[PDB]
């Protein structure tokens, strides 16, 4: 018996007309966004397809769209009668997608939490105060040094460790911009700025995380059906209290995705399926392990091929 795991993408994987091919093939896709639209008070499907992206890149509107997109793929997978995954894991927002798919949080309840989470993060760091930079083709020490050299009494840190030779930094805008130039000077292959509204997973988010800690106490947390590996600790939590505290700590601590993928590999998992839009986490997989296959389930063609193998 082979084993596979589902991985859920974070922020930056959203684009215009995502799940347009799958929506024609499956009515349940548009039903998921319709349920999310009742919570939000606007047609979330209409925002995603029609655009404009500039609205879709606003974090409080970005994350509900990714959550509704990612869960809609899982519902199609479960409707067709696909194989049950051995593990679950999720990047940045993906924890919320994975926890909803795992049966920890309710879908409609999660949309309010995820929307509100975006607003709390935006209150901490206003629009244009901070930015995020993917730094490709450089070791972690050299990136970690480069941030400390150019900080100048401002918050800069490497936050997402996506793969070996790919680290994301976040902090204050100018400090990140000045840090990004220092990494290119050190021999980085590229310092690509992400089009993300808020610098996540850094010390600037702790004011928002303190507010988020009080939110999660109001929300109900069920027992997980599938094992969910968190970003912050690289650990599977069964109890509700431990999952809540992980989601708070996630917001102001780095994402350990390299170790998350390696941990999945240790539990006999031979393949990863990216349950969400784009193909971001698929491209990371080969760089982390090389012998671990992966594919992105974002449209009908990919849905059937992925379903047929496993």
């Amino acid at each position: 018996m082979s084993e596979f795991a589902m991985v859920f993408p974070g922020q930056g994987s959203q684009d215009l007309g995502m799940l347009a091919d799958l929506a024609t093939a499956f009515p349940v896709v548009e039903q998921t966004f319709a349920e999310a639209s009742d919570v939000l008070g606007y047609d979330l499907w209409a925002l995603v397809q029609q655009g404009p992206e500039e609205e879709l890149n606003k974090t409080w509107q970005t994350q509900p769209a990714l959550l509704a997109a990612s869960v809609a793929i899982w519902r199609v997978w479960q409707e067709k009668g696909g194989k049950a995954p051995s593990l679950m894991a999720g990047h940045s927002l993906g924890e919320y997608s994975a926890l909803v798919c795992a049966g920890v949080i309710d879908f409609k309840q999660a949309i309010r939490l995820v929307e509100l989470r975006g607003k709390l993060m935006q209150e901490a760091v206003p629009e244009g105060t901070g930015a995020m930079y993917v730094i490709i083709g450089l070791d972690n020490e050299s990136i970690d040094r480069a941030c400390k050299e150019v900080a100048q009494g401002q918050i800069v840190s490497p936050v997402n460790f996506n793969s070996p030779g790919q680290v994301v930094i976040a902090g204050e805008k100018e400090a990140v911009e000045r840090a990004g130039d220092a990494c290119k000077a050190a021999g980085a292959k590229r310092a690509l700025p992400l089009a993300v509204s808020v610098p996540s997973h850094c010390a600037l988010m702790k004011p928002a995380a303190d507010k988020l800690a009080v939110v999660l106490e109001g929300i109900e947390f069920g027992y997980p059906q599938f094992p969910v590996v968190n970003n912050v600790d690289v650990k599977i939590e069964q109890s509700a209290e431990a999952i809540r505290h992980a989601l708070v700590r996630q917001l102001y601590n780095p994402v350990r995705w390299t170790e998350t993928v390696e941990f999945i590999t240790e539990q006999g998992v031979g393949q990863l399926l990216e349950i969400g839009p784009g193909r971001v986490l698929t491209g990371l997989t080969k760089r982390i392990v090389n012998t671990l296959s992966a594919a992105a389930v974002n449209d009908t063609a990919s849905l059937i091929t992925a379903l047929e193998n496993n």
Partner: protein, 78 residues
């Protein structure tokens, strides 16, 4: 000037193939098996060559070799 000749030259040298073997009509995704980041690295070579700006939203949508050309022509025009 001569965008197709240079777009043919750059993508041929990037993938380690002859110019004759490369096809503008073909799908970069798995016709030549270049991933997301390799496309981001190509995007930077296009910025340096023509003197135009490109962002993740823009360079990620390039599926064909012609799709890269059409972007460059519109950028130089505007």
């Amino acid at each position: 000037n001569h965008p197709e000749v240079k777009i043919k030259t750059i993508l041929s040298l990037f993938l380690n193939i002859n110019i004759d073997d490369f096809n503008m009509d073909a799908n970069l995704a798995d016709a030549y098996d270049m991933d997301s980041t390799e496309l981001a690295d190509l995007a930077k070579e296009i910025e340096k060559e023509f003197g135009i700006s490109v962002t993740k939203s823009q360079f990620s949508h390039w599926e064909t070799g012609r799709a890269v050309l059409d972007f460059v022509s519109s950028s130089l025009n505007d």
